[PDB]
Amino acid sequence: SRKLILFIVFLALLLDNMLLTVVVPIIPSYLYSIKHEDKDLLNENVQVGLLFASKATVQLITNPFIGLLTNRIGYPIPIFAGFCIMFVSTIMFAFSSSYAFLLIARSLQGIGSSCSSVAGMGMLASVYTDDEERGNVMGIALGGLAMGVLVGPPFGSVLYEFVGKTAPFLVLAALVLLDGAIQLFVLQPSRVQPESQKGTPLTTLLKDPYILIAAGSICFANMGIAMLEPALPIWMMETMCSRKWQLGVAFLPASISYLIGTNIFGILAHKMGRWLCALLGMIIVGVSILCIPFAKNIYGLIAPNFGVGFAIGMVDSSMMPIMGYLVDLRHVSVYGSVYAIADVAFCMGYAIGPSAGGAIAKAIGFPWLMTIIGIIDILFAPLCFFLRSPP
Ligand SMILES: COC(=O)[C@H]1[C@H]2C[C@@H]3c4[nH]c5cc(OC)ccc5c4CCN3C[C@H]2C[C@@H](OC(=O)c2cc(OC)c(OC)c(OC)c2)[C@@H]1OC
């Protein structure tokens, strides 16, 4: 039943990102409508920034605890717990309306995300035996992480606009319940205990300056989109008075470009130079983030989002193998390590992006927020030169 576990983990990760991102086009607009119907927007910026960063904050906080828990008790129980609490979070998103319950839903979704991510990928890694097959199947589930983040925004936005706020979350609860049911019913026979081969702890592993540089580059490149995601709908609603179904169609190009850039540069990086590809990715994401605020129409927004997605797809494809090579070279390696580092990096971005950027959006505004983050990416691009390994 190796394939079935792969399907379960793929669906878990896809639903996780879909729930993570469907919040982007409907909930900031929901709070805007519920409070206005501007100092109102000034307070709402920081409120929604904290609401969006709570998921990553709680996930980063609870990741080591859940890792210890799955080491002690096994993989399947954390996976099922993650499915159950993700379904709870989806339902509470669907029905609750006040900001406190939305915050609780976001925190519960973060805990469930940590559960599903770490327990699933670990169990998926342990079930398979062939190294090539392991790499291929992890490439499938990690690709699902991206397919979910792609399909989520437009679907959530359009259904919210047409039917209502309760329907997309109801559908998400339906899929999450189906995945939990299939895992519980047709994947009974045995429990998988994680491997006894433990790599370097994340403390010293992140203490490495080179791994720190790569993780910081990933963190900033994704913090770009992490600051885009909770403030771009508000910027559109206060600038172009766009319909509520376009708030997902505008984020569609970023994810499509991420897919395209990943597929292209996962083959082009080892020939164009991984460090050079990462540096160009940082530069391009900086330029695109600068170009985003100067758009008057969504037609003028499809291009900068395309550049943003293309750059991240390039940075990720140029750093994941770089992270693996650095870990294998300067430390002892277990297949989880790389992912773990990336996870922390991602968390950091989404723990500092919306929480702080929104405050900036309240103090200096949105265009300036984007100018600062783009300049940060541009000036961090030269730091990728310290990835000049001889091969
Ligand atoms: C919280 O996370 C995410 O939201 C996912 C995305 C992060 C970011 C993003 N967000 C958006 C949100 C939008 O609307 C709001 C619109 C566009 C985007 C884009 C384009 C840029 N990018 C796309 C998504 C990337 C996903 O992560 C991986 O794909 C991945 C792949 C791996 O191997 C192939 C890994 O192993 C090393 C790995 O380790 C952790 C992670 C990441 O999941 C962690």
UniProtKB/Swiss-Prot annotation:
Phenotypic consequence of residue 20 to A: Abolishes binding to dihydrotetrabenazine
Protein name: Synaptic vesicular amine transporter
Keyword Glycoprotein: yes
Outcome when changing residue 328 to N: Reduces dopamine uptake. Reduces serotonin uptake
Catalytically driven reaction(s): serotonin(in) + 2 H(+)(out) = serotonin(out) + 2 H(+)(in); dopamine(in) + 2 H(+)(out) = dopamine(out) + 2 H(+)(in); histamine(in) + 2 H(+)(out) = histamine(out) + 2 H(+)(in)
Effect ascribed to mutating residue 17 to T: Abolishes binding to dihydrotetrabenazine. Abolishes serotonin uptake
Membrane disposition: Multi-pass membrane protein
Provenance organism: Homo sapiens
UniProt subcellular location: Cytoplasmic vesicle, Secretory vesicle, Synaptic vesicle membrane; Cytoplasmic vesicle, Secretory vesicle membrane; Cell projection, Axon; Cell projection, Dendrite
